[PDB]
Design a protein around this ligand. Structure first.
Ligand SMILES: *P(=O)(O)OCC(C)(C)[C@@H](O)C(N)=O
Length: 1813
């Protein structure tokens, strides 16, 4: 050992590494500060270990301790050196790992000692990768420190390469800590500066235009009125005016104004200024004369291009160049020499309408070129297109209309103001001229969608928020976004489907969009922020406004890129698109809620009458703001209708206060809706619309003031709904308490039946006035010990079962800015310690009573630590320690300070801190940190405990107990969630998963509940109940737990203590009714439970007499909680920490945060994993969206399984399509017999039949059957044993045309006469011993008489289609008389081809005919050899029971394929174990019953190289349906029946016909090609079992009646019949688990487990066993009590010798002994009456070794052998007690053999001692 100097700055002082070094008994000196070269901490030091050290050691220290300074770096060096290594490992996509290296004089450039490779997942957050890396570097140290300190590791130098990163290089990506890895990279690809990007722009617009004029010179360029201009004509004319302009003094970057109207000369003038070298300044001729003069002076334009009509509008301010004067055009028509560069200005357009007069935005040539070169290929603009010059030329909308289409050869069409505003005439012009593409502003576009257009193919819109997508046209709709400072637009989106917020799209060419926060840092995907624009669109800036240019056009402080502040809020969507979220200044406060008014307009325009809408947020002089909803409709809409239409999806404050009807929205001269031209409302004096009905009396006024105090709404109306205007459960109790001071009593349920003041008055009329119903809480006097509450006694008892448990520790974290004083927080916390007695309360136990003791003062543990982002969790973890309830304070605090935040953490116990106590602790701490004075407390918790304990003696408490004792009586429901194997003991290890409900859906949830007199909790509880029901196999009742506030006395809502109470909720789900009906039923069961909510949970368990199990929590196993919105801002920034604990199997907590819902899924990690919970979270979201949109839909119509799961099930299971030859099996025989007539086909006994001999004899009987009246789909019955004649009959039946119906010859006459009639058949092909057995039914032939054959040996003609019957197999199933399954040829062919693809029987192979032909399995043996042209070895009749004969057939005939039903394979492998004969066997195909798990190794040990296969299939699916290949080294927990065969499909549905997900059980259904036509002469049963289903799209499915479940692998698991199911209080059980112990018992070879209903009806768990030993009940019970719990412990164990199998080898559950019988059981104890028995008990105790022997104990049960009896009889003989060893077998007990053991009386009278002499 040696001294170690541990250097850490951002890690803990007692890390996992430091304390492991102390376990090895090292002296670990810890120094967190900068160490000097000659310090005391450097003396007598042998090793230096560093872990997150934030300083650089001196160069002397590195050399003085060279080879002795070890560093722990969580990065795979040389990659990611320096600071923040784990983040840069993910962002730069470097290799991942951890490194323990040596320290040199640089940053992480030392020789590596040990290095491991870590793996991060795509769905892991960055914080998750931080913990996973910190653990690896700590585990790597623990694993290798001994090898390091002992020199058993040679340092190897770092390989070449790697990255180096410093501090503050991450400041741009600070918000992305909770972002997944795949989303972090997705943002990188979407926002990182591209390497090479695109080619740099090197052209101006007039350069590219002049090149297009050379390409399409005679194409039509511009069309105005009826005249037209070609590209050459337009080019030459502009060149003429440009020569004049340049000669007049036009230089590059000069600004030439243009004041013309939309005409051909406008296009000429624009191109002329460009060709001259300047930039055109568009001035609308209709502007005010002051606006015109402002632009001319601001632009400093010396030349103005106008005509004579608008000439005087300049007032002689410029050199007027008339566009109609011929002298203004020169004679030179050639292109001018180029004097411009791509950096020169191309146009200047002024924008305004707000702050400032007007600002001149300057755009350059490269800006416009980049847009036009993106516009043409994006929309496919060709010279065949025709565009519309719609927008005013003073705005970039015209730049898109003109410049983009000119560079593609298209034609421009000028729009006069006669059609610019009459959109009906514009649609006429477009349809009659062929206008194919154009840009229309948002307002004009939405009013153009109604017109019937056939000309447009692409219509682009933008400017305002697009909401309308339905249009009367065949054109594609595009939505664009972009400021005027950038070129026209920067993002484009094709509107493909309806959207709530239509995205603005993805950036264009050479353009990148960033979503940044206020600190200019990158926001994660989905997080809102300010939109920034980078790329070639950013112009120069504003004209003569350099301050505003430097304000909006900024270079980024870190990325070093020029960006434009848009002032708009947007977020990135996961698809890569951007969506507009509003302007950063248009956020207004309505009723105390910050809302975006743009979120109201889409719902209002969805009204069937509203076409346009705009919601403004005006204000009054008092300061309050009100929302006004302007709408354009054909006529006015009543105020109540618009209030109701928006009340379906929006809250009350988002419903506008007033609505204004408009006929046409006033547009500005620029295409936008004139917002300041909308009519201001007249009633703007705090008017409450019109639904306001003023209070008419003194009670309605008194109720309106109480409602105003609780809800915070001024002037309430008597018709206002409580829940609709912010009403909550807490606010209902506040209304009740506020009425108690008035004197009126209101119950909690009566508010939901009287939700308005109008109804509340009518209820409070009969209610008495001033009575003082509420009594004040009496403050207890000072005592030594105080009383504890019922919940405090429970929480105490909980913490006592494991005194070191943190399962009830309450840990929260708040992230403060670094500017907050750490000690100021500690002082505020120490003030809260004395303010509340709970923070100074200690709990002890006086005898058997738990009492509380108050302490005057207690010191607070405030641990200040320094940490990094990637270590805050590990630091906080090491602080969560168990609490001693006898010591105060029950709360520990501390602040972890990082380089960017101060993380305050506090850990308390649930005995003190509950839901409301957290809210009060937040408000008081926030006020103390704000230096606000607090009013001292008035009440204490110790006094409420006294008041409540006395209420436990009242009559109302007994009345509430009687509720729970009757509510929870009888058999309660059982919720079997699809969990993993439940551990024997209850486990508390857990994890969480979070699901966010967006604000929009949250608003629709709360508006729905309030509209139907429900709370959000009632609505969520119904969805949770349905969600649990559908997972519990669509049960009708469910059970779950909930949490109430438990604040009984109204004076306790300001105290700090444990008040919450747990309530069981027994709810019912009616799947046949609507979602609204179930909503009322959940409330009808919740309100009576809340009326009895103040009975402690442990008393409720006692009243119900709930039995305690080990695997499940008592009563319920799923918990559902819900908290309200945070009261303060500090509570909203608090974060609840879970220390890997799940108190229940599954816990759901709904938290109202950020105007949305954060739903937590706390689950036990032993029952669920990461994948299972993710499925259930998606299913809850799927049910929530279906329910909120289907209020009136039946609950049965809501599906649980998701579409991604349905596609996953299709591929892994039901993708079995394969093309198979349609050649029938009777033709394949005659085809093979033709090619190979002299090949062996059948082998019976020791005789062989060739293909020709077989086919010829088949033809003779066929020709005989043909003339007998055999046609397709005719039935002929067979009565023959296993022989060659049976095979000839079957094939001759098929060749003749009919189907063969197998009948056992040895079947009773009662059975045949049934099939003889049900089938209606006539011919009976029977053998000689069974000819008269048909009783001459009709025409009976003799298969052994040559008269029944013919002489024609030629193949009969083909007379069968693939849809004709091939055989009819009767079932004789349980609970029913035999039914004839009709199988067709194509159905049989698909299975034979399918089984040949998996187990190919080739020509050199053979099959064994051993299954009785009245079973479908035999058919696979009858025809299984034909496809591969093999052979069939017919076993001797009744030789299927002799494993000797079966094994001889496999050896002698080289059989490769064999069928074996289980329970018949076990006797076969029991014969082959002591065998060694050679075998050609390849496949053992098992079918008929469930395969025992122990049989798989038994088969592979007696037969290596074989392929054991478990196969399942009902008779209605021909032969088989699914298969599963079993391997050697395998131990499957059941025997999965596997996946369906080719062209087979299997579905597992519930009781409502919905596909069940993985793990959830249901009914197995078959579908595909090989389905039976139906049941013979039973169309009723055919409809019940062969039903059409939407899964097969109208095609039939066969309902097997078997219970089954999907597995994560995809193989289906057999769970037994749907009927004959055994449950344990609803929670079911698997009998195979009980049959495990029977196999574990070596002497118990085989045994079965079922049930039997007793005389009264209760089924007892009867087990049937056979073995070589005699047991007892007690011995068999104890052997099961190993791991099998008591709820599965059976009872009657009747001993058997063989199992009652039937003809199919399965043990008849009926034929099992019904009334038990030979159930071995023990007797009582002992009573050695006489000393003889006591002597017998002592001698038995010595020989048998049993220290306690009873007089009624069986000799053999205590270890009685034949050797023991001789010892016992010998010891008795030595004390004169004759015992016969034979009697011990007849009388095996002491008392039974006591009268039979006699004495050896030796008399001892002697010979007459009186002797003489
Ligand atoms: P409302 O039923 O929505 O309130 C929710 C509960 C029942 C949790 C609340 O009343 C409470 N803390 O008891």
């Amino acid at each position: 050992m040696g001294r170690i100097l541990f250097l850490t700055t951002f890690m803990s002082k007692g890390n996992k590494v430091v304390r492991y070094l102390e376990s090895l008994h090292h002296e670990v000196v810890i120094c967190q500060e900068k160490v000097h070269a000659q310090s005391a901490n450097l003396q007598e030091i042998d090793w230096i270990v560093s872990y997150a050290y934030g300083y650089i050691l001196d160069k002397e220290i590195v050399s003085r301790f060279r080879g002795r300074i070890i560093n722990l770096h969580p990065s795979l060096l040389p990659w990611n050196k320096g600071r923040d290594p784990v983040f840069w490992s993910v962002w730069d996509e470097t290799p991942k790992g951890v490194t323990i290296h040596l320290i040199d004089e640089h940053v992480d450039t030392g020789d590596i000692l040990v290095q491991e490779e870590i793996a991060f997942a795509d769905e892991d957050t960055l914080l998750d990768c931080y913990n996973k890396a910190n653990q690896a570097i700590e585990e790597l140290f623990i694993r290798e420190w001994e090898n390091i300190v002992h020199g058993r590791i040679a340092p190897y130098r770092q390989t070449a390469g790697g990255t180096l990163h410093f501090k503050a290089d991450r400041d741009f990506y600070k918000n992305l800590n909770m972002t997944t890895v795949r989303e972090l990279l997705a943002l990188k690809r979407l926002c990182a500066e591209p390497k090479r990007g695109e080619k740099p722009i090197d052209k101006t617009f007039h350069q590219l235009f002049e090149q297009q004029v050379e390409m399409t010179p005679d194409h039509v360029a511009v069309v105005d009125r009826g005249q037209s201009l070609t590209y050459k004509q337009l080019n030459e004319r502009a060149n003429q005016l440009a020569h004049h302009l340049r000669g007049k003094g036009v230089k590059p970057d000069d600004q030439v104004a243009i004041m013309l109207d939309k005409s051909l000369d406008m296009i000429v003038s624009i191109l002329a200024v460009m060709k001259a070298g300047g930039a055109y300044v568009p001035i609308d001729p209709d502007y005010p004369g002051e606006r015109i003069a402002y632009m001319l002076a601001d632009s400093s334009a010396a030349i103005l291009l106008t005509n004579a009509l608008h000439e005087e509008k300049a007032n002689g301010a410029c050199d007027i160049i008339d566009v109609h004067d011929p002298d203004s055009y020169s004679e030179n028509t050639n292109n001018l020499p180029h004097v411009n560069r791509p950096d020169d200005l191309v146009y200047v357009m002024y924008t305004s309408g707000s702050t400032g007069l007007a600002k001149g935005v300057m755009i350059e040539h490269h800006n416009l070129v980049n847009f036009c070169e993106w516009y043409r290929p994006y929309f496919g603009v060709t010279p065949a297109d025709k565009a519309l010059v719609y927008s005013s030329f003073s705005f970039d909308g015209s730049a898109l209309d003109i410049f983009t289409h000119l560079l593609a050869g298209a034609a421009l069409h000028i729009v006069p103001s006669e059609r610019k505003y009459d959109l009906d005439a514009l649609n006429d012009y477009c349809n009659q001229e062929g206008i194919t593409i154009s840009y229309l502003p948002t307002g004009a576009a939405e009013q153009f969608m109604q017109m019937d257009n056939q000309s447009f193919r692409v219509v682009i819109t933008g400017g305002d928020v697009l909401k309308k997508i339905e249009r009367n046209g065949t054109y594609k709709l595009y939505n664009g976004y972009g400021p005027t400072e950038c070129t026209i637009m920067v993002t484009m989106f094709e509107v493909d489907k309806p959207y709530a917020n239509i995205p603005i799209g993805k950036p264009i060419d050479r353009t990148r969009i960033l979503i940044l926060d206020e600190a200019l840092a990158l926001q994660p995907i989905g997080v809102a922020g300010e939109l920034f624009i980078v790329g070639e669109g950013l112009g120069r800036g504003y004209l003569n406004r350099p301050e505003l240019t430097a304000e909006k056009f900024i270079v980024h402080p870190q990325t070093g890129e020029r960006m434009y502040r848009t002032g708009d809020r947007a977020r990135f969507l996961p698809d890569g698109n951007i969506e507009f979220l509003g302007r950063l200044d248009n956020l207004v406060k309505i009723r105390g809620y910050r809302i975006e008014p743009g979120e109201i307009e889409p719902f209002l325009m969805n009204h069937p009458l509203i076409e346009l809408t705009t919601v403004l947020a005006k204000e009054q002089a008092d300061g309050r703001k009100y929302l006004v909803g302007y709408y354009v409709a054909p006529e006015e809409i009543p105020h109540g209708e618009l209030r109701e239409w928006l009340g379906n999806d929006l809250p009350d404050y988002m419903i506008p206060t007033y609505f204004v009807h408009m006929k046409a929205f006033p547009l500005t001269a620029n295409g936008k809706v004139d917002r300041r031209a909308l009519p201001d409302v007249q009633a703007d004096a705090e008017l409450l619309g019109e639904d306001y009905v003023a209070p008419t009396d003194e009670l309605e006024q008194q109720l309106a003031q109480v409602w105003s105090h609780v809800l915070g709404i001024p002037q309430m109306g008597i018709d206002d709904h409580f829940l609709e205007r912010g009403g909550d459960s807490i606010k209902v109790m506040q209304l009740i308490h506020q009425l108690k001071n008035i004197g009126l009593s209101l119950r909690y349920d009566q508010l939901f039946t009287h939700p308005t003041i109008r109804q509340l008055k009518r209820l409070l009329t009969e209610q008495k006035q001033v009575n003082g119903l509420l009594e004040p809480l009496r403050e207890l006097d000072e005592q030594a010990e105080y009383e504890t509450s019922a919940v405090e006694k429970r929480m105490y008892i909980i913490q006592q079962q494991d005194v070191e448990s943190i399962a009830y520790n309450v840990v929260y974290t708040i992230n403060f800015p670094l500017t907050v004083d750490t000690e100021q927080i500690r002082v505020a916390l120490e003030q809260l310690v004395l303010r509340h007695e709970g923070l100074r309360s200690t709990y002890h136990m006086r005898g058997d009573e738990i009492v509380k003791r108050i302490v005057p003062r207690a010191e607070l543990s405030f641990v200040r630590q320094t940490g990094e982002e990637e270590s805050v969790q590990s630091l906080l973890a090491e602080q969560i320690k168990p609490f001693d309830l006898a010591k105060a304070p029950l709360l520990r605090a501390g602040v972890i300070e990082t380089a960017d935040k101060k993380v305050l953490w506090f850990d308390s116990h649930h005995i003190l801190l509950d839901g409301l106590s957290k809210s009060i602790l937040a408000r008081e701490l926030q006020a103390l940190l704000g230096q606000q004075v607090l009013s001292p407390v008035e009440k204490t918790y110790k006094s409420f405990a006294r008041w409540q304990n006395e209420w436990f003696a009242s009559d109302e408490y007994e009345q509430q107990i009687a509720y729970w004792k009757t509510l929870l009586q009888g058999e309660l429901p059982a919720v079997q969630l699809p969990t993993k194997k439940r551990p024997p003991q209850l486990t508390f290890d857990g994890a969480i998963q979070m699901y966010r409900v967006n604000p929009e859906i949250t608003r629709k949830l709360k508006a729905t509940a309030a509209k139907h007199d429900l709370t959000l909790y009632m609505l969520m509880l119904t969805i949770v109940s349905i969600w649990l029901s559908k997972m519990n196999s669509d049960s009708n009742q469910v059970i779950l737990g909930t949490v109430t506030d438990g604040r009984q006395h109204p004076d306790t809502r300001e105290l700090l203590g444990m008040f919450v109470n747990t309530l069981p909720l027994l709810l019912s789900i009616d799947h046949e009714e609507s979602f609204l009906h179930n909503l009322q039923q959940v409330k009808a069961k919740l309100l009576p439970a809340l009326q009895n909510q103040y009975v402690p949970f442990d008393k409720i368990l006692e009243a119900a007499r709930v039995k305690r199990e080990g695997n499940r929590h008592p009563l319920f196993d799923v918990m559902f909680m819900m908290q309200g919105a945070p009261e303060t801002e500090l509570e909203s920034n608090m974060h609840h920490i879970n220390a890997g604990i799940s108190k229940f199997d599954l816990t759901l907590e709904v938290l109202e945060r950020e105007n949305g819902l954060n739903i937590v899924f706390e689950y036990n990690t032993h029952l669920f994993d990461e994948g299972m919970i993710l499925r259930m979270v998606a299913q809850f979201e799927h049910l929530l969206l279906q329910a909120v949109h289907g209020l009136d839909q039946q609950v049965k119509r809501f599906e649980l399984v998701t579409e991604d799961e349905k596609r996953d099930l299709f591929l892994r299971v039901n993708d079995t399509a394969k093309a198979y030859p349609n050649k029938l099996i009777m033709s394949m025989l005659e085809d093979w017999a033709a090619a190979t007539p002299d090949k062996t086909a059948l082998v019976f006994r020791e005789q062989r039949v060739t293909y020709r001999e077989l086919n010829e004899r088949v033809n003779q009987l066929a020709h005989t059957l043909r003339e007998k009246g055999v046609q397709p789909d005719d039935l002929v019955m067979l009565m023959a044993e296993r022989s060659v004649e049976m095979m000839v009959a079957i094939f001759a039946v098929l060749k003749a045309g009919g189907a063969y119906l197998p009948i056992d010859p040895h079947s009773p006459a009662e059975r045949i006469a049934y099939i003889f009639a049900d089938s209606g058949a006539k011919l009976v092909l029977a053998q000689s011993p069974f000819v008269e057995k048909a009783s001459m039914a009709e025409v009976v032939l003799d298969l052994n008489s040559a008269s029944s054959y013919a002489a024609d040996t030629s193949n009969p003609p083909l007379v069968n289609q693939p849809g004709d019957l091939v055989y009819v197999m009767y079932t004789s199933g349980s609970t029913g008389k035999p039914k004839g399954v009709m199988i067709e040829h194509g159905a049989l062919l698909n299975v034979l081809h399918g089984m040949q693809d998996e187990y190919p029987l080739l020509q050199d192979d053979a099959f064994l005919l051993k299954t009785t032909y009245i079973f479908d399995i035999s058919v696979a043996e009858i025809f299984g050899w034909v496809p591969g042209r093999g052979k069939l070895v017919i076993l001797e009749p009744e030789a299927e029971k002799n494993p000797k004969a079966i094994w001889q057939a496999v050896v002698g005939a080289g059989i490769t394929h064999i069928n074996f039903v289980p329970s018949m394979l076990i006797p076969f492998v029991e014969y082959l174990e002591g065998r060694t004969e050679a075998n050609r066997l390849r496949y053992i195909l098992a079918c008929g019953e469930a395969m025992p798990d122990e049989l798989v190794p038994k088969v592979y040990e007696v037969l290596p190289e074989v392929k054991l296969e478990n196969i399942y299939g009902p008779t209605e699916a021909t032969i088989y349906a699914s298969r599963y290949s079993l391997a050697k080294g395998s131990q499957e927990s059941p025997v999965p029946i596997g996946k369906p065969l080719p062209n087979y499909r299997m579905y597992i549905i519930n009781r409502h016909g919905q596909l069940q997900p993985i793990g959830v059980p249901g009914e197995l259904c078959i579908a595909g090609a090989s389905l039976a036509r139906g049941y013979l002469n039973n169309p009723a049963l055919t409809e019940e079992k062969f039903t059409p289903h939407p899964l097969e799209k109208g095609e039939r499915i066969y309902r097997t009646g078997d219970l089954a479940r999907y597995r994560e692998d995809g193989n289906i698991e057999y769970l037994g019949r749907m009927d004959h199911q055994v449950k344990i209080r609803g929670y079911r059980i698997e009998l195979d688990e009980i049959r495990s112990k029977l196999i574990q018992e070596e002497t118990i070879q085989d045994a079965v487990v079922v049930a039997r209903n007793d005389q009264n009806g209760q089924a007892y768990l009867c087990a049937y066993l056979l073995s070589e030993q005699e047991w007892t009940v007690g011995q068999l019970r104890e052997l099961l009590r190993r791991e099998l719990p008591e709820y599965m412990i059976p009872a009657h164990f009747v001993l058997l010798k063989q199992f009652p199998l039937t003809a199919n080898g399965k043990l008849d559950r009926k034929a099992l002994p019904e009334p038990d019988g030979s159930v071995k059981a023990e007797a009582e104890y002992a009573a050695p009456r006489t000393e003889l028995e006591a002597t017998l008990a002592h001698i038995w105790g010595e020989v048998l070794g049993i220290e306690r022997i009873g007089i009624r104990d069986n000799f053999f049960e205590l270890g009685g052998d034949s050797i023991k009896g001789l010892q016992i009889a010998s010891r008795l003989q030595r004390i004169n007690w004759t015992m016969v060893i034979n009697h011990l077998f007849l009388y095996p007990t002491i008392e039974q053999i006591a009268p039979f053991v006699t004495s050896e009386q030796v008399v001892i009278e002697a010979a007459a001692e009186n002797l003489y002499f």
